[PDB]
Design a protein around this ligand. Structure first.
Ligand code: HEM
Lengths: 431, 55
């Protein structure tokens, strides 16, 4: 990975790979869904679908080019893919839709066709995708009245008030030269990308992103969306975790790998070395679970999600899981730390070394915006190998022992008890 | 009475019956709580309580 700032202030990052048969060039901006207010929530989701509209995709398809876009809470990306030897054609396409000509995409015929397509997607998401809308409600109750609680797709009530003047106002404040990184992955080398950008002189004005007033803060709270006509119950639960650039960034990732993932219908996932599986397989308390560790610029979340049809024993599934989290402070063993070291190196080795240059362009550009450089995979492996049992017990006594939680749930969640009997399971009464 | 008036046999049998009836009350309190368990308590509104319960 090579990073280089040019004479006019453009940051170029490149990860060359000579054994790939494609190349990807794009632009990553450092503003996401957490840079909006509750009135224009959804302008980033509308800018993505304007880029991927049919009249834009038909111009790129005549040259042999494919388009991609991704909206997150801290960044956005607009990526063009081609063959290794058509990389200057994908730079001319990216020039003519972000720099030199943007008023033909925001015509009134193209805007109203795009807006009714996005309104159909958000309506279909809210009635059909139950594990993913419970995790979005967990962000809105844990970080409430703070910028980190807005959903990345927007809401159905906020999207119907957006006009074409809202999209031009968001682009003038956030699509700036001091907020952008030009990325390149696959079969493309660093010097041909720099010389191709420098051939077009690119005036590129000197604005600056608006700064936010409110800092993100965690609050212990809950939200319940009861629906008795649904067949299951979907629950997420979390504490406050680590941000990016934390010293305990990898220790929180190793603690979630100790408890891991589960699928009750796969025979090999029932044989894993996890002590929680002894409690929940006797009466078949759930269908699946997974533990996460999400990290953002300001704060983070650490917890688990689950789905079950055993709706009369929900209180045993929450009680057995939280009693295993207590063991990280008092009685975590040595075999559990050595097993989670090997499975964490396999997990993020498959994340950073897939064969997709579109996935690598998103991970590379999001990291240079925050740190200015990218940590290597060989240096991340030495940090994981130096974690001891005392490092885990020191982290869990600060973040997990007797702390506030955030809960979200939907479906047949009558058997889920009150806040204060789940909150009292965060300590043991033994010690 | 055990006799012709309130006398010595009256007081000696009143104390032995006084030791016993509190243990019969304790057995009827258990039968009282068994009938409470099948339907639960009422509430000051007089309407159903199956929609909102706390432990
Ligand atoms: C030593 C005597 C008694 C004991 C230990 C006792 C105990 C209890 C307890 C613990 C409850 C639970 C709910 C509540 O507190 O309201 C209850 C309810 C009730 N008791 Fe008693 N009780 C006694 C005497 C009586 C008497 C003398 C009556 C009536 C003549 C009575 C009639 C009731 C009724 C109707 C309820 C239900 C009230 C409701 O659910 O709204 N009990 N009792």
């Amino acid at each position: 990975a090579e990073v280089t700032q040019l004479s006019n202030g453009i940051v170029v990052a490149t990860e060359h790979n000579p054994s790939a048969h494609t190349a990807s060039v794009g632009v990553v901006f450092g503003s996401g869904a957490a840079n909006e207010n509750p009135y224009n929530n959804g302008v980033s989701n509308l800018w993505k679908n304007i880029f991927l509209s049919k009249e834009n995709s038909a111009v790129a398809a005549k040259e042999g080019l494919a388009l991609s876009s991704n909206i997150s809470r801290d960044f956005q990306s607009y990526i063009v893919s081609s063959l290794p030897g058509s990389t200057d054609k994908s730079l001319d396409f990216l020039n003519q839709s972000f720099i030199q000509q943007k008023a033909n995409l925001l015509s009134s015929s193209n805007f109203e066709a795009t807006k009714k397509s996005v309104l159909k997607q958000v309506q279909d998401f809210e009635e059909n995708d139950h594990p993913n809308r419970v995790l979005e409600h967990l962000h809105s109750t844990a970080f409430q009245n703070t910028p980190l609680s807005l959903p990345t797709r927007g809401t159905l009530e906020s999207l119907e008030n957006l006009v074409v003047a809202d999209l031009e106002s968001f682009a003038n404040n956030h699509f700036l030269n001091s907020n952008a990184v030009v990325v390149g992955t696959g079969n493309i080398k660093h010097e041909d990308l720099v010389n191709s950008i420098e051939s077009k002189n690119l005036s590129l004005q000197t604005g600056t992103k608006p700064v936010l007033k409110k800092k993100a803060a965690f609050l212990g709270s809950e939200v319940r969306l009861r629906d008795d006509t649904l067949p299951k119950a979907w629950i997420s639960l979390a504490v406050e975790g680590e941000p990016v650039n934390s010293p305990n960034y990898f220790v929180a990732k190793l603690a979630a790998q100790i408890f891991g993932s589960y699928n009750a219908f796969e025979p090999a996932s029932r044989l894993q070395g996890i002590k929680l599986l002894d409690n929940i397989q006797e009466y078949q308390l759930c269908d699946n679970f997974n533990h996460f560790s999400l990290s953002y610029k300001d704060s983070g979340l650490w917890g688990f999600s689950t789905a079950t049809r055993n709706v009369t024993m929900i209180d045993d599934l929450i009680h057995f899981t939280l009693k295993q989290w207590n063991r990280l402070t008092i009685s975590v063993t040595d075999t559990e730390v050595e097993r989670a070291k090997s499975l964490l190196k396999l997990q993020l080795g498959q994340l950073y070394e897939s064969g997709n240059p579109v996935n690598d362009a998103n991970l590379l550009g999001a990291e240079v915006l925050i740190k200015g450089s990218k940590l290597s995979l060989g240096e991340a492996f030495k940090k994981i190998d130096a974690i001891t049992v005392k490092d885990v017990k020191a982290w869990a006594g600060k973040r997990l022992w007797d702390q506030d939680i955030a809960i979200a749930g939907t479906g047949q969640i009558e058997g889920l008890l009150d806040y204060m009997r789940i909150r009292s399971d965060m300590s043991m009464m033994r010690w | 009475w055990g006799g012709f008036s309130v006398s010595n046999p009256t007081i000696q049998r009143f104390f032995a019956l006084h030791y016993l009836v509190p243990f019969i009350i304790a057995a009827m309190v258990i039968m009282h709580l068994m009938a409470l368990h099948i339907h639960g308590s009422s509430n000051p509104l007089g309407i159903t309580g199956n929609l909102d319960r706390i432990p």
